Amino acid sequence: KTEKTVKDADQNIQDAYTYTIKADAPTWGKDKKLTAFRFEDELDKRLDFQKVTEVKAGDTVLGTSDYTVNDPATDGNKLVVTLTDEGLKKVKSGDKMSLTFEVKRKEVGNTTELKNRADVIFNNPNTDKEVKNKTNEVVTYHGKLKVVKKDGKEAGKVLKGAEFELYQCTSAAVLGKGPLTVDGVKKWTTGDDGTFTIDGLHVTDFEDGKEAAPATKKFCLKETKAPAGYALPDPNVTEIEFTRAKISEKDKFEGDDEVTLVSEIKNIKQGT
Ligand SMILES: [Ca+2]
């Protein structure tokens, strides 16, 4: 069957991840040859194609002379991987074709979901007819994380200058991997409105194209520096339940839209 898979677990915005397209080549006798075979994939506009990592015909790993790659940036983000005449010679009747390529998601954009589907288009050597087989659709979800720094007492007082790191964690008491780099940044500071937004993070409840198995996967914000005149909170680690359903909630805080999770973190004035 014609199948698409995505390997994206824990890959945030601007982290490389991969798609794989698998399809059966047609069958043909010794008196014929495969005259055309290509993969096509309309990449979501939020993706930046990086490179093809592998093209295989059965167990044969193809080389760059065996296929051509277009430039998705100049073809409306459509990727086309076409077997050359040398590449078509390496294809055996009924071979399982495979294409793996790498992308980066540039931003969350207007939906947490980012879908992908592909087509395999070839000439059937038995009839010389063009055949087009579409894959299933796979989905990758990312959301924005907005942090709003406030004074624990004085309601409505937002605080500039608070500094934070981000970690993977099982809980706020047990930090995992980090400080994480997200789109070249590994430390964020609250601005004049007491906020910053991390655009963006991989959701925890869905990964590699399917629902995640029940697990205690979370993100944690570590406040490393409090605003001037404020004591560093204890605890200074805030855990975030960064799921599709939690992100989708809206109008609970300023800037709380369906693609952003808003986390309000309190600080007590130095000397209480
Ligand atoms: Ca929201």
Numbering used by the authors: 184 to 455
What is the paper's account of this structure, in its own sentences?
SpaD, the subject of this report, is the major pilin protein that forms the polymeric backbone, or shaft, of one of the three types of pilus expressed by the human pathogen C. diphtheriae. SpaD is an elongated molecule of ∼125 Å in length built from three tandem domains with Ig-type folds. As in some of the other Gram-positive major pilins, these three domains comprise a single CnaA-type domain flanked by two CnaB-type domains. Two crystal structures, of the full-length three-domain protein at 2.5 Å resolution and of a two-domain (D2-D3) construct at 1.87 Å resolution, show that each of the three Ig-like domains contains a single Lys–Asn isopeptide-bond cross-link, assumed to give mechanical stability as in other such pili.
We therefore sought to prepare a stable truncated fragment of SpaD that could be crystallized and used to solve the structure of the full-length protein by molecular replacement. This was achieved by partial trypsin digestion of the full-length selenomethionine-labelled form of SpaD (SeMet SpaD). Mass spectrometry confirmed the mass of the resulting product to be 30 456.00 Da, corresponding to residues 180–455. This truncated form of SpaD (SeMet SpaDtryp) was crystallized in space group P212121 and its structure was solved by single-wavelength anomalous diffraction (SAD) methods from in-house data collected at a wavelength of 1.5418 Å, utilizing the signals from one Se atom, one Ca2+ ion and two S atoms (from a disulfide bond). The calcium ion was also used during phasing of SeMet SpaDtryp and gave rise to an anomalous signal consistent with that expected from calcium at an X-ray wavelength of 1.5418 Å. In contrast, domains D2 and D3 are almost linearly connected, with strands β17 and β18 running through the length of both domains. The D3 domain contains a calcium-binding site formed within a loop between strands β23 and β24.
